[PDB]
Symmetry: C2
Subunit: 191 residues, 2 copies
């Protein structure tokens, strides 16, 4: 009933519907019925369908930023330990069927929708941070310097994509952690 808790509950319900039915496939009435509140109440928190999609996608973007922030902001970790931590958190997000990550990947392939500039613009901040991790790895001679940090960062997103699909096919923590390590060793050979 507290306003901040209500708003989060409504956002989580909309994200739930987006993950099940598709981004923007939630009516205010649908959200109202999940929250057992009135339609007027949902419109109080999200005056338009546009505002609801924008704020849900902002939450999704923030969750991805937080996933990288937890693994990349530790100061005493090699590049390969950081990559392992990212792969581990992604795998668990799949096994836990986390709605935000399912919407994140659907968002990424929505290339003809009007929401797709916001996917790109939000994720260049994440690419910048990932590239910084690869640059620090190069400085520490943990990987070779012959490939650009931007290319390495883009390739990490490609790794996350295949790890995402494979973890949905086989949601097995041990099996997928073993798979992630092999991918990382192939893509990012040690130095």
């Amino acid at each position: 009933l507290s306003p901040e808790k209500r708003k989060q509950q409504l956002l989580d319900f909309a994200l739930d519907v987006f993950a099940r039915r598709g981004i923007g496939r939630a009516g205010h009435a649908d959200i109202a019925e999940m929250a057992n509140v009135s339609v007027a109440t949902v419109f109080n928190y999200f005056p338009t369908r546009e505002a609801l999609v924008e704020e849900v996608l902002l939450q999704v973007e923030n969750r991805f930023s937080l996933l990288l922030s937890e693994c990349l902001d530790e100061q005493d970790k090699t590049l390969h330990a950081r990559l392992r931590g990212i792969s581990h958190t992604l795998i668990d997000a799949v096994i836990e069927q986390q709605d935000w990550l399912k919407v994140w990947f659907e968002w990424s392939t929505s290339v003809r929708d009007d929401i797709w500039p916001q996917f790109i613009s939000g994720n260049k901040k994440s690419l910048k941070r990932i590239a910084a991790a690869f640059e620090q790895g190069k400085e520490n001679n943990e990987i070779d310097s012959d490939n650009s940090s931007d290319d390495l960062a883009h390739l990490l997103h490609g790794l996350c994509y295949i790890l995402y699909l494979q973890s949905n096919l086989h949601p097995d923590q041990d099996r997928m952690r073993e798979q992630a390590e092999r991918y990382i060793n192939t893509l990012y050979p040690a130095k």
Copy 2:
């Protein structure tokens, strides 16, 4: 228009509609208007939404297979020329805004949908073909033997995903072919 030509035309129109609006949207009336036939006629060929989707996705699956066959069936090409050809064909499919490829990638991230097991079941005949290409490359000492052919094949899918997104951002043939070469050199260094 004989009935089998009419059905193929409706399927091609359905692909157009699904690429614009999403695989999950009721397209019978939209397809009807594109074909200049009644919506009853479209339901004669596709009695349910589920039938229309399954048959469109089978066409999409076949189109990806034909891309692979065209790039893999020469059998005297080197591995890196095959990888280059696949990447170039993908880039041009984005620049030409080919509907089947947009739908293919949306299908790939539809992981909770009843349609996803078919994405996987068609994807393993693709993986197996790509894996064999990598194995032949390892046989001719064109790449390191250090990484399993199945892993290399999965990683190629991740490379295609990143190239797909970047080509949609920057549908610039020169820039994307340069980008693809860097990716191939990073993931699959020659010799």
